[PDB]
Symmetry: C2
Subunit: 184 residues, 2 copies
């Protein structure tokens, strides 16, 4: 019963195109540079990372973040959902931790260990959370570009899921950033 009100939250924080893609058809994020940010203005990430206890991420996102030329961007543990992945690559054993099983169980287990506020990342992972109605908050930064193909943020659902608008503002002059909480 009501883990959110008891202080446990699953939080989405993601950039999408106008048409709902989180990567283009080549798996790239170059379109994120379609809007200038010369002065390196922060639009929520430092504060998200300070708030969350860890991340739950899919293998597709992990594989795109892991690289030879990579500066690991996360200050909190990344829990990676793979039925497929048996071991964490060299250099990332204190950064990335494997979790397996039913989402509800995985979440119960992390929460019991004190990882109560989780940053849920990755399209398949987010979609899977939403299929069990496990997302409490989403902050979506929408870019004024139609990509016309790519990796979708959202998928299919058994029934519609309603949210409240907590806040919406224009950031960096040409982005909208809207904060949704799931309706109780």
């Amino acid at each position: 019963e009501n883990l959110y009100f008891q202080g446990m939250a699953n939080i989405v924080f993601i950039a999408t195109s106008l048409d709902g893609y989180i990567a283009d058809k080549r798996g790239k994020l170059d379109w994120l540079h379609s809007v200038p940010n010369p002065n390196n203005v922060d639009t929520g990430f430092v504060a998200l990372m300070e708030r969350v206890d860890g991340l739950v991420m899919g293998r597709n996102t992990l594989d795109m973040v892991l690289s030879f030329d990579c500066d690991w961007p996360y200050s909190k543990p990344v829990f990676v959902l793979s039925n497929t992945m048996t071991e964490v690559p060299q250099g990332y054993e204190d950064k990335v931790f494997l979790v397996k099983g039913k989402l509800v169980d995985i979440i119960a287990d992390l929460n019991a260990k004190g990882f109560n506020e989780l940053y849920i990342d990755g399209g398949v992972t987010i979609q899977n959370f939403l299929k069990e109605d496990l997302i409490d908050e989403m902050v979506i930064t929408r870019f004024p570009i139609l990509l016309g193909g790519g990796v979708p943020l959202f998928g299919e659902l058994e029934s519609s899921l309603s949210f409240n608008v907590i806040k919406s503002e224009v950031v960096l002059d040409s982005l909208t950033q809207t904060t949704y909480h799931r309706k109780r």
Copy 2:
């Protein structure tokens, strides 16, 4: 001279739900019947361009014709207009660039483009100048999408964004020329 989209969408980008229905549009209360741009839009535009799907949806509401301006239905199959709508609805056939050229020449210069399939076809030829999207806070998880495929991306500028009726966001995008 402008081709303008003015449409409501779910958070996940649908313009009708998985059953073809629009109930989710009455999920945000509007007891005072506030205008969220439609009246000012109809005043501005010279006409509408829509397709068979939107025509049929409007006719399905069993209400008074809502449009003060002529409605052009873009269709390469329809040859006759629904009975009673001969003074209201006109068919246009052929290449889009030609259709727009012919309408503009007749003084139909500001056009409200409606319909998923029609908007998509304008987008595939980069013929959309402005879009006002009113986004509802609901994941439908299925339905009729607003957007489809493009060969290549299209960039816009955010002219304005605001919360309307407390729970909706309404953003005005102009095509980056």
